[PDB]
PDB file of all heavy atoms in Angstrom:
ATOM      1  N   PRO A  57       0.836  -1.205   0.002  1.00 51.31           N
ATOM      2  CA  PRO A  57       0.006  -0.008   0.003  1.00 51.31           C
ATOM      3  C   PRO A  57       0.869   1.250  -0.002  1.00 51.31           C
ATOM      4  O   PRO A  57       1.854   1.344   0.723  1.00 51.31           O
ATOM      5  CB  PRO A  57      -0.809  -0.130   1.291  1.00 51.31           C
ATOM      6  CG  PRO A  57      -0.778  -1.590   1.641  1.00 51.31           C
ATOM      7  CD  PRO A  57       0.583  -2.054   1.174  1.00 51.31           C
ATOM      8  N   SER A  58       0.481   2.216  -0.829  1.00 50.15           N
ATOM      9  CA  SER A  58       1.279   3.426  -0.992  1.00 50.15           C
ATOM     10  C   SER A  58       0.368   4.555  -1.469  1.00 50.15           C
ATOM     11  O   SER A  58      -0.777   4.368  -1.878  1.00 50.15           O
ATOM     12  CB  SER A  58       2.436   3.220  -1.947  1.00 50.15           C
ATOM     13  OG  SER A  58       3.188   4.403  -2.122  1.00 50.15           O
ATOM     14  N   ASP A  59       0.898   5.774  -1.403  1.00 50.27           N
ATOM     15  CA  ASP A  59       0.237   6.957  -1.927  1.00 50.27           C
ATOM     16  C   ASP A  59       0.460   7.152  -3.417  1.00 50.27           C
ATOM     17  O   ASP A  59      -0.102   8.078  -4.007  1.00 50.27           O
ATOM     18  CB  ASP A  59       0.710   8.213  -1.176  1.00 50.27           C
ATOM     19  CG  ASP A  59       0.790   7.979   0.324  1.00 50.27           C
ATOM     20  OD1 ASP A  59      -0.199   7.468   0.913  1.00 50.27           O
ATOM     21  OD2 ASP A  59       1.841   8.332   0.924  1.00 50.27           O
ATOM     22  N   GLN A  60       1.289   6.289  -4.045  1.00 47.21           N
ATOM     23  CA  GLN A  60       1.696   6.482  -5.424  1.00 47.21           C
ATOM     24  C   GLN A  60       2.002   5.123  -6.023  1.00 47.21           C
ATOM     25  O   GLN A  60       2.011   4.105  -5.337  1.00 47.21           O
ATOM     26  CB  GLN A  60       2.917   7.395  -5.491  1.00 47.21           C
ATOM     27  CG  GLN A  60       3.981   7.037  -4.470  1.00 47.21           C
ATOM     28  CD  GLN A  60       5.306   7.737  -4.722  1.00 47.21           C
ATOM     29  OE1 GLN A  60       5.547   8.218  -5.829  1.00 47.21           O
ATOM     30  NE2 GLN A  60       6.155   7.813  -3.718  1.00 47.21           N
ATOM     31  N   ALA A  61       2.281   5.124  -7.330  1.00 46.29           N
ATOM     32  CA  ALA A  61       2.753   3.924  -7.996  1.00 46.29           C
ATOM     33  C   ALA A  61       4.273   3.855  -7.861  1.00 46.29           C
ATOM     34  O   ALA A  61       4.875   4.579  -7.066  1.00 46.29           O
ATOM     35  CB  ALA A  61       2.312   3.915  -9.461  1.00 46.29           C
ATOM     36  N   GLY A  62       4.904   3.004  -8.641  1.00 47.40           N
ATOM     37  CA  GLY A  62       6.342   2.865  -8.615  1.00 47.40           C
ATOM     38  C   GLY A  62       6.794   1.504  -8.068  1.00 47.40           C
ATOM     39  O   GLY A  62       5.986   0.644  -7.731  1.00 47.40           O
ATOM     40  N   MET A  63       8.094   1.335  -8.022  1.00 53.83           N
ATOM     41  CA  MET A  63       8.715   0.117  -7.555  1.00 53.83           C
ATOM     42  C   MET A  63       9.478   0.349  -6.264  1.00 53.83           C
ATOM     43  O   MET A  63      10.232   1.339  -6.156  1.00 53.83           O
ATOM     44  CB  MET A  63       9.663  -0.465  -8.632  1.00 53.83           C
ATOM     45  CG  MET A  63      10.754  -1.364  -8.068  1.00 53.83           C
ATOM     46  SD  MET A  63      11.736  -2.184  -9.332  1.00 53.83           S
ATOM     47  CE  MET A  63      10.589  -3.450  -9.869  1.00 53.83           C
ATOM     48  N   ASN A  64       9.283  -0.548  -5.294  1.00 53.69           N
ATOM     49  CA  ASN A  64      10.068  -0.501  -4.060  1.00 53.69           C
ATOM     50  C   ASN A  64      11.473  -1.040  -4.310  1.00 53.69           C
ATOM     51  O   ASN A  64      12.451  -0.304  -4.201  1.00 53.69           O
ATOM     52  CB  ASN A  64       9.350  -1.286  -2.962  1.00 53.69           C
ATOM     53  CG  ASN A  64       8.044  -0.632  -2.530  1.00 53.69           C
ATOM     54  OD1 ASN A  64       8.003   0.555  -2.286  1.00 53.69           O
ATOM     55  ND2 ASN A  64       7.004  -1.426  -2.450  1.00 53.69           N
ATOM     56  N   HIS A  65      11.574  -2.323  -4.665  1.00 54.59           N
ATOM     57  CA  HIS A  65      12.857  -2.925  -4.956  1.00 54.59           C
ATOM     58  C   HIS A  65      12.650  -4.042  -5.983  1.00 54.59           C
ATOM     59  O   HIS A  65      11.513  -4.346  -6.376  1.00 54.59           O
ATOM     60  CB  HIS A  65      13.512  -3.454  -3.684  1.00 54.59           C
ATOM     61  CG  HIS A  65      12.844  -4.655  -3.085  1.00 54.59           C
ATOM     62  ND1 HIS A  65      11.953  -4.547  -2.016  1.00 54.59           N
ATOM     63  CD2 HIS A  65      12.886  -5.955  -3.395  1.00 54.59           C
ATOM     64  CE1 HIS A  65      11.501  -5.739  -1.708  1.00 54.59           C
ATOM     65  NE2 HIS A  65      12.068  -6.629  -2.509  1.00 54.59           N
ATOM     66  N   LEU A  66      13.773  -4.620  -6.430  1.00 54.62           N
ATOM     67  CA  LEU A  66      13.777  -5.716  -7.379  1.00 54.62           C
ATOM     68  C   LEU A  66      14.718  -6.794  -6.883  1.00 54.62           C
ATOM     69  O   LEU A  66      15.816  -6.500  -6.422  1.00 54.62           O
ATOM     70  CB  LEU A  66      14.227  -5.201  -8.766  1.00 54.62           C
ATOM     71  CG  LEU A  66      14.422  -6.217  -9.869  1.00 54.62           C
ATOM     72  CD1 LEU A  66      13.163  -7.008 -10.120  1.00 54.62           C
ATOM     73  CD2 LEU A  66      14.880  -5.532 -11.164  1.00 54.62           C
ATOM     74  N   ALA A  67      14.262  -8.037  -6.957  1.00 49.26           N
ATOM     75  CA  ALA A  67      14.975  -9.146  -6.335  1.00 49.26           C
ATOM     76  C   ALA A  67      15.304 -10.210  -7.367  1.00 49.26           C
ATOM     77  O   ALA A  67      14.512 -10.517  -8.249  1.00 49.26           O
ATOM     78  CB  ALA A  67      14.176  -9.784  -5.210  1.00 49.26           C
ATOM     79  N   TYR A  68      16.518 -10.773  -7.252  1.00 48.14           N
ATOM     80  CA  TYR A  68      16.966 -11.870  -8.086  1.00 48.14           C
ATOM     81  C   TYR A  68      17.430 -13.021  -7.220  1.00 48.14           C
ATOM     82  O   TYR A  68      18.057 -12.807  -6.168  1.00 48.14           O
ATOM     83  CB  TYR A  68      18.103 -11.426  -9.025  1.00 48.14           C
ATOM     84  CG  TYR A  68      17.629 -10.654 -10.207  1.00 48.14           C
ATOM     85  CD1 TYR A  68      17.141  -9.359 -10.078  1.00 48.14           C
ATOM     86  CD2 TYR A  68      17.639 -11.201 -11.490  1.00 48.14           C
ATOM     87  CE1 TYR A  68      16.670  -8.650 -11.158  1.00 48.14           C
ATOM     88  CE2 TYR A  68      17.189 -10.508 -12.593  1.00 48.14           C
ATOM     89  CZ  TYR A  68      16.691  -9.228 -12.401  1.00 48.14           C
ATOM     90  OH  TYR A  68      16.231  -8.520 -13.479  1.00 48.14           O
ATOM     91  N   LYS A  69      17.152 -14.246  -7.645  1.00 49.57           N
ATOM     92  CA  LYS A  69      17.514 -15.441  -6.886  1.00 49.57           C
ATOM     93  C   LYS A  69      18.879 -15.955  -7.342  1.00 49.57           C
ATOM     94  O   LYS A  69      19.184 -15.965  -8.530  1.00 49.57           O
ATOM     95  CB  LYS A  69      16.458 -16.535  -7.056  1.00 49.57           C
ATOM     96  CG  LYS A  69      16.664 -17.710  -6.116  1.00 49.57           C
ATOM     97  CD  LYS A  69      15.498 -18.701  -6.194  1.00 49.57           C
ATOM     98  CE  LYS A  69      15.633 -19.782  -5.142  1.00 49.57           C
ATOM     99  NZ  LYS A  69      14.485 -20.735  -5.174  1.00 49.57           N
ATOM    100  N   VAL A  70      19.694 -16.345  -6.374  1.00 49.18           N
ATOM    101  CA  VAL A  70      20.991 -16.908  -6.638  1.00 49.18           C
ATOM    102  C   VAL A  70      20.940 -18.419  -6.357  1.00 49.18           C
ATOM    103  O   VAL A  70      20.002 -18.917  -5.738  1.00 49.18           O
ATOM    104  CB  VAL A  70      22.123 -16.203  -5.821  1.00 49.18           C
ATOM    105  CG1 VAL A  70      22.154 -14.726  -6.134  1.00 49.18           C
ATOM    106  CG2 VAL A  70      21.937 -16.456  -4.347  1.00 49.18           C
ATOM    107  N   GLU A  71      21.959 -19.130  -6.817  1.00 49.55           N
ATOM    108  CA  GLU A  71      21.920 -20.593  -6.762  1.00 49.55           C
ATOM    109  C   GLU A  71      22.035 -21.101  -5.335  1.00 49.55           C
ATOM    110  O   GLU A  71      21.248 -21.958  -4.917  1.00 49.55           O
ATOM    111  CB  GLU A  71      23.035 -21.191  -7.638  1.00 49.55           C
ATOM    112  CG  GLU A  71      23.049 -22.698  -7.693  1.00 49.55           C
ATOM    113  CD  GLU A  71      24.078 -23.249  -8.658  1.00 49.55           C
ATOM    114  OE1 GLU A  71      24.763 -22.431  -9.310  1.00 49.55           O
ATOM    115  OE2 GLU A  71      24.224 -24.478  -8.751  1.00 49.55           O
ATOM    116  N   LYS A  72      22.978 -20.578  -4.570  1.00 49.72           N
ATOM    117  CA  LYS A  72      23.241 -21.102  -3.224  1.00 49.72           C
ATOM    118  C   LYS A  72      23.466 -19.927  -2.268  1.00 49.72           C
ATOM    119  O   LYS A  72      23.749 -18.793  -2.689  1.00 49.72           O
ATOM    120  CB  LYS A  72      24.430 -22.056  -3.210  1.00 49.72           C
ATOM    121  CG  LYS A  72      24.205 -23.303  -4.067  1.00 49.72           C
ATOM    122  CD  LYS A  72      25.301 -24.330  -3.904  1.00 49.72           C
ATOM    123  CE  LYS A  72      24.987 -25.587  -4.714  1.00 49.72           C
ATOM    124  NZ  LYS A  72      26.013 -26.644  -4.510  1.00 49.72           N
ATOM    125  N   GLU A  73      23.346 -20.236  -0.978  1.00 52.11           N
ATOM    126  CA  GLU A  73      23.485 -19.204   0.045  1.00 52.11           C
ATOM    127  C   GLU A  73      24.873 -18.581   0.071  1.00 52.11           C
ATOM    128  O   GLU A  73      25.018 -17.375   0.293  1.00 52.11           O
ATOM    129  CB  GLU A  73      23.172 -19.790   1.444  1.00 52.11           C
ATOM    130  CG  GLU A  73      21.688 -19.944   1.712  1.00 52.11           C
ATOM    131  CD  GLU A  73      21.043 -18.619   2.102  1.00 52.11           C
ATOM    132  OE1 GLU A  73      21.767 -17.627   2.313  1.00 52.11           O
ATOM    133  OE2 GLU A  73      19.780 -18.571   2.155  1.00 52.11           O
ATOM    134  N   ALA A  74      25.899 -19.392  -0.207  1.00 55.39           N
ATOM    135  CA  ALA A  74      27.262 -18.864  -0.203  1.00 55.39           C
ATOM    136  C   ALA A  74      27.521 -17.886  -1.335  1.00 55.39           C
ATOM    137  O   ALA A  74      28.508 -17.156  -1.296  1.00 55.39           O
ATOM    138  CB  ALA A  74      28.258 -20.021  -0.271  1.00 55.39           C
ATOM    139  N   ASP A  75      26.662 -17.885  -2.369  1.00 55.76           N
ATOM    140  CA  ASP A  75      26.847 -16.922  -3.455  1.00 55.76           C
ATOM    141  C   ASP A  75      26.709 -15.480  -2.959  1.00 55.76           C
ATOM    142  O   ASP A  75      27.356 -14.584  -3.517  1.00 55.76           O
ATOM    143  CB  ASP A  75      25.834 -17.180  -4.579  1.00 55.76           C
ATOM    144  CG  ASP A  75      26.049 -18.515  -5.268  1.00 55.76           C
ATOM    145  OD1 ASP A  75      27.164 -19.031  -5.218  1.00 55.76           O
ATOM    146  OD2 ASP A  75      25.092 -19.011  -5.876  1.00 55.76           O
ATOM    147  N   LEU A  76      25.886 -15.254  -1.934  1.00 57.80           N
ATOM    148  CA  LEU A  76      25.669 -13.904  -1.443  1.00 57.80           C
ATOM    149  C   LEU A  76      26.960 -13.296  -0.898  1.00 57.80           C
ATOM    150  O   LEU A  76      27.251 -12.113  -1.147  1.00 57.80           O
ATOM    151  CB  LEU A  76      24.570 -13.915  -0.379  1.00 57.80           C
ATOM    152  CG  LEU A  76      23.189 -14.377  -0.863  1.00 57.80           C
ATOM    153  CD1 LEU A  76      22.128 -14.158   0.201  1.00 57.80           C
ATOM    154  CD2 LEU A  76      22.834 -13.633  -2.162  1.00 57.80           C
ATOM    155  N   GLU A  77      27.724 -14.083  -0.125  1.00 59.91           N
ATOM    156  CA  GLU A  77      28.979 -13.552   0.395  1.00 59.91           C
ATOM    157  C   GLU A  77      29.985 -13.240  -0.736  1.00 59.91           C
ATOM    158  O   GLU A  77      30.616 -12.192  -0.743  1.00 59.91           O
ATOM    159  CB  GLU A  77      29.612 -14.546   1.373  1.00 59.91           C
ATOM    160  CG  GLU A  77      29.340 -14.237   2.844  1.00 59.91           C
ATOM    161  CD  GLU A  77      27.980 -14.724   3.288  1.00 59.91           C
ATOM    162  OE1 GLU A  77      27.418 -15.618   2.644  1.00 59.91           O
ATOM    163  OE2 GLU A  77      27.474 -14.198   4.311  1.00 59.91           O
ATOM    164  N   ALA A  78      30.071 -14.153  -1.707  1.00 60.65           N
ATOM    165  CA  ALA A  78      31.010 -13.939  -2.826  1.00 60.65           C
ATOM    166  C   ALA A  78      30.602 -12.741  -3.665  1.00 60.65           C
ATOM    167  O   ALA A  78      31.429 -11.903  -4.021  1.00 60.65           O
ATOM    168  CB  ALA A  78      31.110 -15.187  -3.673  1.00 60.65           C
ATOM    169  N   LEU A  79      29.304 -12.658  -3.995  1.00 58.76           N
ATOM    170  CA  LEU A  79      28.823 -11.504  -4.755  1.00 58.76           C
ATOM    171  C   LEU A  79      28.924 -10.224  -3.931  1.00 58.76           C
ATOM    172  O   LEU A  79      29.169  -9.155  -4.499  1.00 58.76           O
ATOM    173  CB  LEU A  79      27.377 -11.740  -5.204  1.00 58.76           C
ATOM    174  CG  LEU A  79      27.185 -12.859  -6.229  1.00 58.76           C
ATOM    175  CD1 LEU A  79      25.716 -13.079  -6.526  1.00 58.76           C
ATOM    176  CD2 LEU A  79      27.958 -12.578  -7.520  1.00 58.76           C
ATOM    177  N   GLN A  80      28.747 -10.305  -2.607  1.00 61.36           N
ATOM    178  CA  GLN A  80      28.865  -9.121  -1.765  1.00 61.36           C
ATOM    179  C   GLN A  80      30.267  -8.530  -1.835  1.00 61.36           C
ATOM    180  O   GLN A  80      30.447  -7.320  -1.894  1.00 61.36           O
ATOM    181  CB  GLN A  80      28.500  -9.462  -0.316  1.00 61.36           C
ATOM    182  CG  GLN A  80      28.700  -8.335   0.681  1.00 61.36           C
ATOM    183  CD  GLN A  80      28.354  -8.761   2.091  1.00 61.36           C
ATOM    184  OE1 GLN A  80      28.881  -9.751   2.591  1.00 61.36           O
ATOM    185  NE2 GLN A  80      27.465  -7.994   2.739  1.00 61.36           N
ATOM    186  N   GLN A  81      31.291  -9.409  -1.833  1.00 57.84           N
ATOM    187  CA  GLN A  81      32.671  -8.908  -1.922  1.00 57.84           C
ATOM    188  C   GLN A  81      32.961  -8.335  -3.294  1.00 57.84           C
ATOM    189  O   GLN A  81      33.658  -7.321  -3.409  1.00 57.84           O
ATOM    190  CB  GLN A  81      33.642 -10.064  -1.608  1.00 57.84           C
ATOM    191  CG  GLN A  81      33.438 -10.700  -0.241  1.00 57.84           C
ATOM    192  CD  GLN A  81      34.573 -11.621   0.151  1.00 57.84           C
ATOM    193  OE1 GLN A  81      35.706 -11.447  -0.259  1.00 57.84           O
ATOM    194  NE2 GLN A  81      34.233 -12.668   0.906  1.00 57.84           N
ATOM    195  N   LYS A  82      32.417  -8.940  -4.350  1.00 55.43           N
ATOM    196  CA  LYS A  82      32.611  -8.385  -5.688  1.00 55.43           C
ATOM    197  C   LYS A  82      31.943  -7.024  -5.822  1.00 55.43           C
ATOM    198  O   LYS A  82      32.514  -6.075  -6.375  1.00 55.43           O
ATOM    199  CB  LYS A  82      32.045  -9.330  -6.745  1.00 55.43           C
ATOM    200  CG  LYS A  82      32.879 -10.585  -6.985  1.00 55.43           C
ATOM    201  CD  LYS A  82      32.325 -11.404  -8.134  1.00 55.43           C
ATOM    202  CE  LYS A  82      33.210 -12.570  -8.476  1.00 55.43           C
ATOM    203  NZ  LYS A  82      32.709 -13.333  -9.647  1.00 55.43           N
ATOM    204  N   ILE A  83      30.719  -6.891  -5.278  1.00 56.67           N
ATOM    205  CA  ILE A  83      29.986  -5.627  -5.399  1.00 56.67           C
ATOM    206  C   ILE A  83      30.703  -4.531  -4.579  1.00 56.67           C
ATOM    207  O   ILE A  83      30.872  -3.400  -5.071  1.00 56.67           O
ATOM    208  CB  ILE A  83      28.542  -5.803  -4.896  1.00 56.67           C
ATOM    209  CG1 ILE A  83      27.766  -6.714  -5.848  1.00 56.67           C
ATOM    210  CG2 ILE A  83      27.845  -4.462  -4.807  1.00 56.67           C
ATOM    211  CD1 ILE A  83      26.408  -7.109  -5.330  1.00 56.67           C
ATOM    212  N   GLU A  84      31.159  -4.874  -3.381  1.00 58.20           N
ATOM    213  CA  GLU A  84      31.765  -3.851  -2.534  1.00 58.20           C
ATOM    214  C   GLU A  84      33.176  -3.482  -2.991  1.00 58.20           C
ATOM    215  O   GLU A  84      33.643  -2.382  -2.721  1.00 58.20           O
ATOM    216  CB  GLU A  84      31.792  -4.335  -1.090  1.00 58.20           C
ATOM    217  CG  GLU A  84      30.438  -4.247  -0.411  1.00 58.20           C
ATOM    218  CD  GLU A  84      30.382  -4.907   0.942  1.00 58.20           C
ATOM    219  OE1 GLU A  84      31.435  -5.442   1.387  1.00 58.20           O
ATOM    220  OE2 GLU A  84      29.311  -4.891   1.559  1.00 58.20           O
ATOM    221  N   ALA A  85      33.840  -4.380  -3.709  1.00 58.88           N
ATOM    222  CA  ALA A  85      35.110  -4.017  -4.338  1.00 58.88           C
ATOM    223  C   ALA A  85      34.888  -3.025  -5.477  1.00 58.88           C
ATOM    224  O   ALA A  85      35.696  -2.120  -5.677  1.00 58.88           O
ATOM    225  CB  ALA A  85      35.837  -5.264  -4.831  1.00 58.88           C
ATOM    226  N   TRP A  86      33.781  -3.205  -6.203  1.00 57.38           N
ATOM    227  CA  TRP A  86      33.428  -2.262  -7.274  1.00 57.38           C
ATOM    228  C   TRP A  86      33.154  -0.862  -6.756  1.00 57.38           C
ATOM    229  O   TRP A  86      33.304   0.109  -7.518  1.00 57.38           O
ATOM    230  CB  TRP A  86      32.219  -2.829  -8.029  1.00 57.38           C
ATOM    231  CG  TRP A  86      31.450  -1.856  -8.869  1.00 57.38           C
ATOM    232  CD1 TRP A  86      30.509  -0.942  -8.410  1.00 57.38           C
ATOM    233  CD2 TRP A  86      31.479  -1.702 -10.288  1.00 57.38           C
ATOM    234  NE1 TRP A  86      29.982  -0.235  -9.473  1.00 57.38           N
ATOM    235  CE2 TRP A  86      30.580  -0.691 -10.634  1.00 57.38           C
ATOM    236  CE3 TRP A  86      32.215  -2.326 -11.305  1.00 57.38           C
ATOM    237  CZ2 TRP A  86      30.362  -0.296 -11.944  1.00 57.38           C
ATOM    238  CZ3 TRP A  86      32.001  -1.935 -12.612  1.00 57.38           C
ATOM    239  CH2 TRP A  86      31.099  -0.911 -12.928  1.00 57.38           C
ATOM    240  N   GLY A  87      32.759  -0.730  -5.486  1.00 58.78           N
ATOM    241  CA  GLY A  87      32.475   0.572  -4.895  1.00 58.78           C
ATOM    242  C   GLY A  87      31.058   0.734  -4.399  1.00 58.78           C
ATOM    243  O   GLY A  87      30.734   1.828  -3.904  1.00 58.78           O
ATOM    244  N   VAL A  88      30.188  -0.276  -4.468  1.00 58.03           N
ATOM    245  CA  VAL A  88      28.812  -0.178  -4.006  1.00 58.03           C
ATOM    246  C   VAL A  88      28.725  -0.807  -2.625  1.00 58.03           C
ATOM    247  O   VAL A  88      29.132  -1.959  -2.421  1.00 58.03           O
ATOM    248  CB  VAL A  88      27.840  -0.867  -4.994  1.00 58.03           C
ATOM    249  CG1 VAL A  88      26.436  -0.900  -4.413  1.00 58.03           C
ATOM    250  CG2 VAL A  88      27.879  -0.180  -6.337  1.00 58.03           C
ATOM    251  N   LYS A  89      28.164  -0.049  -1.674  1.00 58.17           N
ATOM    252  CA  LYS A  89      27.960  -0.565  -0.338  1.00 58.17           C
ATOM    253  C   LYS A  89      26.762  -1.503  -0.293  1.00 58.17           C
ATOM    254  O   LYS A  89      25.724  -1.247  -0.903  1.00 58.17           O
ATOM    255  CB  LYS A  89      27.772   0.573   0.670  1.00 58.17           C
ATOM    256  CG  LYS A  89      28.981   1.451   0.870  1.00 58.17           C
ATOM    257  CD  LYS A  89      28.713   2.555   1.892  1.00 58.17           C
ATOM    258  CE  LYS A  89      29.932   3.399   2.160  1.00 58.17           C
ATOM    259  NZ  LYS A  89      31.053   2.600   2.684  1.00 58.17           N
ATOM    260  N   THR A  90      26.900  -2.609   0.439  1.00 59.29           N
ATOM    261  CA  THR A  90      25.842  -3.594   0.576  1.00 59.29           C
ATOM    262  C   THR A  90      25.481  -3.763   2.047  1.00 59.29           C
ATOM    263  O   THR A  90      26.236  -3.356   2.936  1.00 59.29           O
ATOM    264  CB  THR A  90      26.248  -4.950  -0.005  1.00 59.29           C
ATOM    265  OG1 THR A  90      27.298  -5.516   0.787  1.00 59.29           O
ATOM    266  CG2 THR A  90      26.726  -4.800  -1.447  1.00 59.29           C
ATOM    267  N   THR A  91      24.326  -4.345   2.274  1.00 57.40           N
ATOM    268  CA  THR A  91      23.899  -4.753   3.601  1.00 57.40           C
ATOM    269  C   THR A  91      23.190  -6.099   3.468  1.00 57.40           C
ATOM    270  O   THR A  91      22.774  -6.511   2.369  1.00 57.40           O
ATOM    271  CB  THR A  91      22.959  -3.729   4.257  1.00 57.40           C
ATOM    272  OG1 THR A  91      22.850  -4.021   5.659  1.00 57.40           O
ATOM    273  CG2 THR A  91      21.590  -3.779   3.621  1.00 57.40           C
ATOM    274  N   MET A  92      23.065  -6.810   4.588  1.00 55.67           N
ATOM    275  CA  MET A  92      22.501  -8.147   4.601  1.00 55.67           C
ATOM    276  C   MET A  92      21.314  -8.166   5.557  1.00 55.67           C
ATOM    277  O   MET A  92      21.483  -8.255   6.776  1.00 55.67           O
ATOM    278  CB  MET A  92      23.548  -9.170   5.002  1.00 55.67           C
ATOM    279  CG  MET A  92      23.102 -10.618   4.831  1.00 55.67           C
ATOM    280  SD  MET A  92      23.024 -11.130   3.099  1.00 55.67           S
ATOM    281  CE  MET A  92      24.752 -11.209   2.694  1.00 55.67           C
ATOM    282  N   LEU A  93      20.098  -8.111   5.009  1.00 56.63           N
ATOM    283  CA  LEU A  93      18.890  -8.389   5.778  1.00 56.63           C
ATOM    284  C   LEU A  93      18.776  -9.904   5.965  1.00 56.63           C
ATOM    285  O   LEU A  93      18.901 -10.667   4.986  1.00 56.63           O
ATOM    286  CB  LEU A  93      17.667  -7.854   5.061  1.00 56.63           C
ATOM    287  CG  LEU A  93      17.900  -6.797   3.956  1.00 56.63           C
ATOM    288  CD1 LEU A  93      16.763  -6.770   2.982  1.00 56.63           C
ATOM    289  CD2 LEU A  93      18.096  -5.426   4.589  1.00 56.63           C
ATOM    290  N   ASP A  94      18.574 -10.347   7.199  1.00 53.14           N
ATOM    291  CA  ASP A  94      18.625 -11.766   7.513  1.00 53.14           C
ATOM    292  C   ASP A  94      17.275 -12.426   7.238  1.00 53.14           C
ATOM    293  O   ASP A  94      16.367 -11.808   6.669  1.00 53.14           O
ATOM    294  CB  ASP A  94      19.113 -11.987   8.943  1.00 53.14           C
ATOM    295  CG  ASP A  94      18.054 -11.639   9.961  1.00 53.14           C
ATOM    296  OD1 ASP A  94      17.206 -10.773   9.676  1.00 53.14           O
ATOM    297  OD2 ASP A  94      18.099 -12.230  11.075  1.00 53.14           O
ATOM    298  N   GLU A  95      17.128 -13.682   7.686  1.00 51.74           N
ATOM    299  CA  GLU A  95      15.933 -14.453   7.397  1.00 51.74           C
ATOM    300  C   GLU A  95      14.694 -13.791   7.985  1.00 51.74           C
ATOM    301  O   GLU A  95      14.737 -13.248   9.106  1.00 51.74           O
ATOM    302  CB  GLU A  95      16.072 -15.869   7.929  1.00 51.74           C
ATOM    303  CG  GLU A  95      17.232 -16.693   7.362  1.00 51.74           C
ATOM    304  CD  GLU A  95      18.572 -16.348   8.020  1.00 51.74           C
ATOM    305  OE1 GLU A  95      18.634 -15.394   8.811  1.00 51.74           O
ATOM    306  OE2 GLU A  95      19.549 -17.065   7.728  1.00 51.74           O
ATOM    307  N   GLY A  96      13.595 -13.866   7.259  1.00 52.81           N
ATOM    308  CA  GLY A  96      12.330 -13.348   7.749  1.00 52.81           C
ATOM    309  C   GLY A  96      12.110 -11.858   7.587  1.00 52.81           C
ATOM    310  O   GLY A  96      11.071 -11.358   8.006  1.00 52.81           O
ATOM    311  N   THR A  97      13.082 -11.125   7.016  1.00 53.82           N
ATOM    312  CA  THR A  97      12.840  -9.720   6.698  1.00 53.82           C
ATOM    313  C   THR A  97      11.606  -9.566   5.836  1.00 53.82           C
ATOM    314  O   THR A  97      10.772  -8.684   6.059  1.00 53.82           O
ATOM    315  CB  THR A  97      14.059  -9.116   6.022  1.00 53.82           C
ATOM    316  OG1 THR A  97      15.218  -9.263   6.879  1.00 53.82           O
ATOM    317  CG2 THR A  97      13.849  -7.635   5.749  1.00 53.82           C
TER     318      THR A  97
END
């Protein structure tokens, strides 16, 4: 529910849980800051 249209976020599925750590290091080396919302967010 919102006062407007638009997109909140966009999500992509990875193969395994360990991919998130590896991709996180690649992303943060590129210069983009990441965060990790845990289970049940």
Side-chain angles (χ1 to χ4, degrees):
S58 179
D59 316 311
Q60 45 168 342
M63 155 173 285
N64 293 312
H65 69 261
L66 174 57
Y68 282 71
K69 189 173 187 179
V70 302
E71 182 174 358
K72 298 187 177 184
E73 281 283 350
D75 294 338
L76 297 188
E77 262 82 21
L79 294 175
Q80 176 181 53
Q81 302 190 32
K82 287 186 174 183
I83 293 171
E84 284 171 0
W86 161 281
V88 174
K89 293 181 178 299
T90 67
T91 194
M92 189 73 71
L93 342 156
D94 73 332
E95 299 81 352
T97 303

